[PDB]
Protein backbone atom coordinates (compact mmCIF):
# COMPACT_ATOMS: atom_id res chain seq x y z
CA UNK A 1 0.00 0.00 0.00
CA UNK A 2 0.96 3.67 0.15
CA UNK A 3 4.08 4.70 2.04
CA UNK A 4 4.30 5.99 5.62
CA UNK A 5 5.86 9.25 4.46
CA UNK A 6 3.22 11.40 6.12
CA UNK A 7 3.44 9.13 9.15
CA UNK A 8 7.09 10.21 9.36
CA UNK A 9 6.45 13.89 8.59
CA UNK A 10 3.47 14.19 10.97
CA UNK A 11 5.08 12.25 13.81
CA UNK A 12 4.34 14.09 17.03
CA UNK A 13 7.87 13.83 18.49
CA UNK A 14 11.12 13.99 16.53
CA UNK A 15 14.34 12.53 17.87
CA UNK A 16 17.40 14.42 19.05
CA UNK A 17 19.94 15.08 16.31
CA UNK A 18 22.61 13.03 18.09
CA UNK A 19 20.14 10.11 18.20
CA UNK A 20 18.37 10.64 14.88
CA UNK A 21 15.67 8.06 14.15
CA UNK A 22 15.78 5.98 10.97
CA UNK A 23 12.70 4.38 9.41
CA UNK A 24 13.01 1.84 6.60
CA UNK A 25 10.40 1.93 3.82
CA UNK A 26 10.04 -1.02 1.45
CA UNK A 27 7.43 -3.04 -0.45
CA UNK A 28 5.53 0.15 -1.10
CA UNK A 29 4.10 2.57 -3.66
CA UNK A 30 5.59 5.99 -2.93
CA UNK A 31 3.62 9.17 -3.68
CA UNK A 32 6.09 12.04 -3.29
CA UNK A 33 3.65 14.67 -4.58
CA UNK A 34 2.06 15.18 -1.15
CA UNK A 35 5.52 15.72 0.35
CA UNK A 36 6.66 18.06 -2.43
CA UNK A 37 3.39 20.04 -2.36
CA UNK A 38 3.02 20.74 1.38
CA UNK A 39 3.35 24.34 2.51
CA UNK A 40 5.49 24.23 5.69
CA UNK A 41 8.45 22.43 4.05
CA UNK A 42 10.50 25.61 3.84
CA UNK A 43 13.55 23.64 2.64
CA UNK A 44 13.27 20.88 0.02
CA UNK A 45 16.69 19.96 -1.38
CA UNK A 46 17.18 16.88 -3.56
CA UNK A 47 20.66 15.60 -4.40
CA UNK A 48 21.15 13.25 -7.32
CA UNK A 49 17.40 13.13 -8.03
CA UNK A 50 14.90 15.60 -9.47
CA UNK A 51 12.01 16.43 -7.11
CA UNK A 52 9.41 16.47 -9.89
CA UNK A 53 10.54 13.22 -11.55
CA UNK A 54 10.73 11.32 -8.23
CA UNK A 55 7.43 9.63 -9.06
CA UNK A 56 9.06 8.14 -12.18
CA UNK A 57 11.70 6.16 -10.25
CA UNK A 58 11.67 3.03 -8.10
CA UNK A 59 14.30 2.13 -5.51
CA UNK A 60 15.04 -1.04 -3.58
CA UNK A 61 14.77 0.72 -0.21
CA UNK A 62 14.00 4.16 1.21
CA UNK A 63 15.14 5.45 4.61
CA UNK A 64 13.74 8.44 6.51
CA UNK A 65 16.06 10.03 9.09
CA UNK A 66 14.14 12.50 11.27
CA UNK A 67 15.61 14.82 13.91
CA UNK A 68 15.34 18.35 15.32
CA UNK A 69 18.08 20.97 14.98
CA UNK A 70 18.37 24.75 15.04
CA UNK A 71 17.42 26.84 12.03
CA UNK A 72 21.02 27.88 11.37
CA UNK A 73 22.22 24.26 11.50
CA UNK A 74 19.96 23.19 8.62
CA UNK A 75 22.64 24.28 6.15
CA UNK A 76 24.84 21.45 7.46
CA UNK A 77 22.38 18.73 6.37
CA UNK A 78 23.85 18.39 2.89
CA UNK A 79 26.72 16.47 1.24
CA UNK A 80 30.20 17.87 1.76
CA UNK A 81 29.21 20.07 4.71
CA UNK A 82 31.16 20.31 7.95
CA UNK A 83 30.51 21.83 11.33
CA UNK A 84 28.81 21.10 14.62
CA UNK A 85 26.22 18.66 13.26
CA UNK A 86 27.87 17.17 10.17
CA UNK A 87 30.99 16.23 12.14
CA UNK A 88 29.49 14.75 15.31
CA UNK A 89 25.73 14.25 14.89
CA UNK A 90 24.55 13.42 11.35
CA UNK A 91 26.91 13.05 8.38
CA UNK A 92 25.68 12.63 4.80
CA UNK A 93 27.94 11.02 2.17
CA UNK A 94 29.34 13.10 -0.66
CA UNK A 95 27.58 10.79 -3.15
CA UNK A 96 24.25 11.17 -1.34
CA UNK A 97 21.22 10.36 -3.50
CA UNK A 98 18.07 11.59 -1.80
CA UNK A 99 16.16 14.60 -0.55
CA UNK A 100 16.53 16.71 2.61
CA UNK A 101 13.38 18.34 3.99
CA UNK A 102 13.22 20.80 6.90
CA UNK A 103 10.48 22.99 8.35
CA UNK A 104 10.23 25.31 11.34
CA UNK A 105 8.61 23.70 14.39
CA UNK A 106 8.65 26.77 16.65
CA UNK A 107 4.94 26.49 17.47
CA UNK A 108 5.41 22.93 18.78
CA UNK A 109 9.09 22.46 19.77
CA UNK A 110 9.56 25.68 21.78
CA UNK A 111 8.49 26.10 25.40
CA UNK A 112 8.63 29.39 27.34
CA UNK A 113 11.45 29.18 29.90
CA UNK A 114 13.25 26.74 27.57
CA UNK A 115 12.77 23.33 25.94
CA UNK A 116 15.87 21.40 27.03
CA UNK A 117 14.63 17.97 25.87
CA UNK A 118 16.55 18.22 22.57
CA UNK A 119 20.28 17.55 22.78
CA UNK A 120 23.20 17.41 20.37
CA UNK A 121 26.80 16.22 20.49
CA UNK A 122 29.31 19.08 20.36
CA UNK A 123 32.49 17.20 21.35
CA UNK A 124 33.82 14.07 19.69
CA UNK A 125 37.30 12.62 19.28
CA UNK A 126 36.75 12.33 15.52
CA UNK A 127 34.20 13.07 12.81
CA UNK A 128 31.32 10.73 12.03
CA UNK A 129 31.32 8.50 8.99
CA UNK A 130 28.33 9.05 6.68
CA UNK A 131 25.09 7.71 8.19
CA UNK A 132 26.86 6.79 11.43
CA UNK A 133 25.16 7.12 14.81
CA UNK A 134 26.87 7.70 18.17
CA UNK A 135 24.52 7.76 21.18
CA UNK A 136 27.21 7.13 23.81
CA UNK A 137 27.07 9.46 26.82
CA UNK A 138 30.58 8.71 28.10
CA UNK A 139 32.34 11.73 29.57
CA UNK A 140 34.60 13.39 27.00
CA UNK A 141 38.16 13.60 28.33
CA UNK A 142 39.42 16.88 26.87
CA UNK A 143 42.37 17.02 29.30
CA UNK A 144 45.33 14.87 30.31
CA UNK A 145 44.45 13.45 33.73
CA UNK A 146 41.85 10.63 33.62
CA UNK A 147 38.78 12.09 35.34
CA UNK A 148 37.16 8.71 35.99
CA UNK A 149 33.78 9.22 34.36
CA UNK A 150 32.77 12.29 36.40
CA UNK A 151 32.21 15.65 34.74
CA UNK A 152 34.75 18.17 35.96
CA UNK A 153 37.70 20.28 34.81
CA UNK A 154 38.83 19.41 31.27
CA UNK A 155 36.24 16.65 30.90
CA UNK A 156 32.66 17.44 29.90
CA UNK A 157 29.42 15.75 28.97
CA UNK A 158 29.49 15.68 25.14
CA UNK A 159 25.73 16.35 24.81
CA UNK A 160 24.43 19.93 24.82
CA UNK A 161 20.77 20.88 25.17
CA UNK A 162 19.33 23.21 22.55
CA UNK A 163 17.06 25.10 24.95
CA UNK A 164 14.60 26.48 22.41
CA UNK A 165 12.23 29.28 23.39
CA UNK A 166 9.29 30.75 21.44
CA UNK A 167 11.29 33.96 21.00
CA UNK A 168 14.78 34.11 19.41
CA UNK A 169 15.51 34.60 15.73
CA UNK A 170 14.53 32.17 13.01
CA UNK A 171 18.12 30.91 13.08
CA UNK A 172 17.78 29.70 16.68
CA UNK A 173 14.25 28.31 16.45
CA UNK A 174 13.73 24.54 16.21
CA UNK A 175 13.63 22.98 12.75
CA UNK A 176 12.24 19.51 12.11
CA UNK A 177 14.37 17.75 9.49
CA UNK A 178 13.66 14.47 7.68
CA UNK A 179 16.17 13.07 5.17
CA UNK A 180 15.00 10.59 2.53
CA UNK A 181 17.75 8.28 1.26
CA UNK A 182 16.98 6.27 -1.88
CA UNK A 183 18.81 2.96 -2.26
CA UNK A 184 19.56 0.59 -5.14
CA UNK A 185 21.41 -2.66 -4.53
CA UNK A 186 20.78 -4.96 -7.56
CA UNK A 187 17.93 -6.43 -5.48
CA UNK A 188 14.40 -6.24 -6.92
CA UNK A 189 12.77 -2.83 -6.73
CA UNK A 190 10.09 -2.44 -4.07
CA UNK A 191 9.23 1.30 -3.87
CA UNK A 192 7.71 2.68 -7.09
CA UNK A 193 5.80 5.85 -7.86
CA UNK A 194 2.60 4.72 -9.60
Amino acid at each position, epitope marked *: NLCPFHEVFNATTFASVYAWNRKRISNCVADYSVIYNFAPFFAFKCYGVSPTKLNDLCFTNVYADSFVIRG*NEVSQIAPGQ*T*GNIA*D*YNYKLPDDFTGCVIAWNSNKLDSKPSGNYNYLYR*F*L*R*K*S*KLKPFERDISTEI*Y*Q*A*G*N*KPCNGVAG*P*NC*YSPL*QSY*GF*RP*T*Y*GV*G*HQPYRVVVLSFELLHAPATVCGP
Partner: antibody
Amino acid sequence: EVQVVESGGGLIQPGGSLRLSCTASELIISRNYMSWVRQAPGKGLEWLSVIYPGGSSFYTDSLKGRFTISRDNSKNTLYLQMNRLGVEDTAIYYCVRDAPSESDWGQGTLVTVSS
Amino acid sequence: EIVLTQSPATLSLFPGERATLSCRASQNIGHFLTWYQQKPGQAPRLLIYDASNRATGVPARFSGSGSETEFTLTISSLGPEDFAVYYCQERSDWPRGTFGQGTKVEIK
Protein backbone atom coordinates in the same frame (compact mmCIF):
# COMPACT_ATOMS: atom_id res chain seq x y z
CA GLU B 1 44.95 27.45 36.05
CA VAL B 2 45.05 26.02 32.53
CA GLN B 3 47.95 27.59 30.62
CA VAL B 4 47.94 27.97 26.84
CA VAL B 5 51.26 29.39 25.63
CA GLU B 6 51.61 31.09 22.25
CA SER B 7 54.84 31.76 20.38
CA GLY B 8 56.23 32.74 17.00
CA GLY B 9 54.95 36.32 17.14
CA GLY B 10 57.23 39.23 16.36
CA LEU B 11 58.24 41.81 13.80
CA ILE B 12 57.55 41.00 10.15
CA GLN B 13 57.62 43.07 6.99
CA PRO B 14 54.37 43.93 5.19
CA GLY B 15 53.58 41.19 2.72
CA GLY B 16 55.53 38.70 4.83
CA SER B 17 54.34 35.60 6.64
CA LEU B 18 54.34 34.31 10.21
CA ARG B 19 53.28 31.07 11.92
CA LEU B 20 52.15 31.59 15.50
CA SER B 21 52.34 28.43 17.60
CA CYS B 22 50.22 27.58 20.64
CA THR B 23 50.68 24.80 23.19
CA ALA B 24 48.92 23.87 26.42
CA SER B 25 50.06 22.28 29.67
CA GLU B 26 47.22 20.16 31.07
CA LEU B 27 44.99 19.76 28.00
CA ILE B 28 45.22 18.04 24.62
CA ILE B 29 44.90 20.63 21.87
CA SER B 30 43.61 17.99 19.44
CA ARG B 31 40.50 17.50 21.61
CA ASN B 32 39.44 21.12 22.21
CA TYR B 33 37.72 23.93 20.30
CA MET B 34 40.91 25.95 19.85
CA SER B 35 40.38 29.41 18.34
CA TRP B 36 42.63 32.35 17.50
CA VAL B 37 41.68 35.87 18.56
CA ARG B 38 43.49 39.19 18.18
CA GLN B 39 43.25 42.61 19.82
CA ALA B 40 44.56 45.40 17.60
CA PRO B 41 46.57 47.94 19.61
CA GLY B 42 44.07 50.15 21.40
CA LYS B 43 41.06 48.51 19.74
CA GLY B 44 38.48 45.84 20.49
CA LEU B 45 39.03 42.12 20.23
CA GLU B 46 38.42 40.21 17.00
CA TRP B 47 37.87 36.49 16.51
CA LEU B 48 39.99 35.10 13.66
CA SER B 49 39.71 31.32 13.34
CA VAL B 50 38.65 28.10 15.05
CA ILE B 51 39.59 24.44 14.59
CA TYR B 52 37.15 21.84 15.87
CA PRO B 53 38.09 18.74 17.89
CA GLY B 54 37.40 16.61 14.81
CA GLY B 55 39.47 18.77 12.45
CA SER B 56 37.03 21.25 10.86
CA SER B 57 38.44 24.78 10.70
CA PHE B 58 36.48 28.00 10.19
CA TYR B 59 37.62 31.56 9.52
CA THR B 60 36.22 35.06 9.38
CA ASP B 61 35.25 36.20 5.90
CA SER B 62 38.01 38.83 5.91
CA LEU B 63 40.72 36.23 6.64
CA LYS B 64 39.77 33.23 4.47
CA GLY B 65 42.75 32.29 2.31
CA ARG B 66 45.28 34.39 4.22
CA PHE B 67 45.26 32.72 7.65
CA THR B 68 45.42 28.92 7.87
CA ILE B 69 44.82 27.31 11.26
CA SER B 70 46.22 23.82 11.78
CA ARG B 71 47.79 21.70 14.51
CA ASP B 72 50.32 18.94 15.12
CA ASN B 73 48.64 16.06 16.94
CA SER B 74 52.05 14.63 17.89
CA LYS B 75 53.58 17.86 19.24
CA ASN B 76 50.36 19.06 20.93
CA THR B 77 50.83 22.43 19.20
CA LEU B 78 48.27 24.64 17.46
CA TYR B 79 49.52 26.75 14.55
CA LEU B 80 48.23 29.75 12.62
CA GLN B 81 49.99 30.24 9.29
CA MET B 82 49.71 33.94 8.42
CA ASN B 83 50.29 34.94 4.79
CA ARG B 84 50.37 38.29 2.98
CA LEU B 85 50.41 40.23 6.24
CA GLY B 86 49.53 43.91 6.08
CA VAL B 87 50.21 46.77 8.46
CA GLU B 88 46.63 46.53 9.77
CA ASP B 89 47.35 42.93 10.85
CA THR B 90 49.27 44.25 13.86
CA ALA B 91 47.68 42.96 17.06
CA ILE B 92 48.14 40.73 20.10
CA TYR B 93 47.09 37.25 19.00
CA TYR B 94 45.38 35.13 21.66
CA CYS B 95 45.06 31.34 21.50
CA VAL B 96 41.80 30.61 23.31
CA ARG B 97 40.39 27.17 24.12
CA ASP B 98 36.59 27.15 24.03
CA ALA B 99 34.31 25.10 26.28
CA PRO B 100 30.64 25.76 27.06
CA SER B 101 31.45 27.05 30.56
CA GLU B 102 35.18 27.82 30.14
CA SER B 103 37.33 29.95 27.85
CA ASP B 104 41.08 29.80 28.50
CA TRP B 105 42.96 32.55 26.68
CA GLY B 106 46.72 32.65 26.35
CA GLN B 107 48.86 35.60 27.37
CA GLY B 108 48.93 36.66 23.72
CA THR B 109 51.89 37.07 21.36
CA LEU B 110 52.37 40.48 19.76
CA VAL B 111 52.66 40.58 15.96
CA THR B 112 54.03 43.84 14.55
CA VAL B 113 53.72 44.14 10.76
CA SER B 114 55.82 47.19 9.90
CA SER B 115 58.90 48.20 7.93
CA GLU C 1 26.84 40.72 10.55
CA ILE C 2 25.73 41.19 14.15
CA VAL C 3 27.12 44.36 15.76
CA LEU C 4 26.87 44.77 19.53
CA THR C 5 26.61 48.26 21.03
CA GLN C 6 27.91 48.72 24.58
CA SER C 7 26.86 51.75 26.63
CA PRO C 8 28.15 53.70 28.47
CA ALA C 9 31.57 53.87 26.81
CA THR C 10 33.04 54.69 30.23
CA LEU C 11 31.29 54.08 33.56
CA SER C 12 32.63 56.23 36.40
CA LEU C 13 31.66 54.93 39.84
CA PHE C 14 32.93 54.85 43.40
CA PRO C 15 34.08 51.57 44.95
CA GLY C 16 31.12 49.83 46.56
CA GLU C 17 28.50 51.33 44.25
CA ARG C 18 26.35 49.26 41.91
CA ALA C 19 27.53 49.15 38.29
CA THR C 20 25.17 48.29 35.44
CA LEU C 21 26.52 47.70 31.93
CA SER C 22 24.49 47.38 28.73
CA CYS C 23 25.05 45.51 25.46
CA ARG C 24 22.51 45.88 22.64
CA ALA C 25 22.61 43.48 19.69
CA SER C 26 21.47 44.36 16.17
CA GLN C 27 19.81 40.94 15.76
CA ASN C 28 17.91 38.60 18.06
CA ILE C 29 20.63 36.35 19.51
CA GLY C 30 18.53 34.75 22.25
CA HIS C 31 20.60 34.07 25.35
CA PHE C 32 23.85 33.56 23.40
CA LEU C 33 25.90 36.38 24.88
CA THR C 34 29.15 36.19 26.84
CA TRP C 35 30.77 38.77 29.12
CA TYR C 36 34.54 39.15 29.41
CA GLN C 37 36.73 41.19 31.75
CA GLN C 38 40.13 42.49 30.64
CA LYS C 39 42.59 44.01 33.07
CA PRO C 40 45.35 46.12 31.49
CA GLY C 41 48.02 43.80 30.15
CA GLN C 42 45.99 40.62 30.74
CA ALA C 43 43.87 38.33 28.59
CA PRO C 44 40.07 38.61 28.80
CA ARG C 45 38.44 36.74 31.67
CA LEU C 46 35.15 34.91 31.19
CA LEU C 47 32.53 36.25 33.63
CA ILE C 48 29.07 35.30 32.32
CA TYR C 49 28.10 32.76 29.66
CA ASP C 50 24.63 32.42 28.13
CA ALA C 51 24.04 35.99 29.38
CA SER C 52 22.98 34.71 32.81
CA ASN C 53 25.22 31.85 34.00
CA ARG C 54 28.14 32.82 36.22
CA ALA C 55 31.45 31.25 35.23
CA THR C 56 33.31 29.12 37.75
CA GLY C 57 35.33 31.15 40.23
CA VAL C 58 33.59 34.45 39.47
CA PRO C 59 32.47 36.24 42.66
CA ALA C 60 28.72 36.35 43.20
CA ARG C 61 28.60 40.14 42.76
CA PHE C 62 28.60 39.68 38.97
CA SER C 63 25.16 39.00 37.50
CA GLY C 64 24.11 39.06 33.86
CA SER C 65 20.55 39.44 32.61
CA GLY C 66 18.49 40.23 29.53
CA SER C 67 17.76 38.30 26.36
CA GLU C 68 17.23 38.64 22.61
CA THR C 69 18.60 42.14 21.98
CA GLU C 70 19.05 43.79 25.41
CA PHE C 71 21.64 42.32 27.78
CA THR C 72 23.11 43.86 30.92
CA LEU C 73 25.86 43.00 33.39
CA THR C 74 25.29 44.14 36.98
CA ILE C 75 28.01 44.41 39.63
CA SER C 76 26.36 44.63 43.04
CA SER C 77 29.35 46.24 44.78
CA LEU C 78 32.35 47.45 42.78
CA GLY C 79 35.38 46.05 44.54
CA PRO C 80 38.90 47.43 44.27
CA GLU C 81 39.58 44.78 41.60
CA ASP C 82 36.36 45.25 39.58
CA PHE C 83 37.65 48.21 37.52
CA ALA C 84 38.40 46.91 34.02
CA VAL C 85 37.07 46.80 30.45
CA TYR C 86 34.01 44.57 30.01
CA TYR C 87 33.35 43.00 26.60
CA CYS C 88 30.11 41.39 25.46
CA GLN C 89 30.46 38.72 22.77
CA GLU C 90 27.52 37.24 20.89
CA ARG C 91 28.02 33.47 20.65
CA SER C 92 25.16 32.72 18.27
CA ASP C 93 27.65 30.55 16.32
CA TRP C 94 29.70 29.29 19.27
CA PRO C 95 32.70 29.39 19.56
CA ARG C 96 32.60 32.14 16.91
CA GLY C 97 31.27 35.57 17.77
CA THR C 98 31.58 39.33 17.53
CA PHE C 99 32.71 41.36 20.53
CA GLY C 100 31.41 44.66 21.81
CA GLN C 101 33.54 47.77 22.01
CA GLY C 102 34.00 47.55 25.79
CA THR C 103 32.74 49.55 28.78
CA LYS C 104 35.65 50.83 30.86
CA VAL C 105 35.04 51.49 34.56
CA GLU C 106 37.08 54.54 35.58
CA ILE C 107 36.51 57.27 38.18
CA LYS C 108 39.80 59.05 38.96
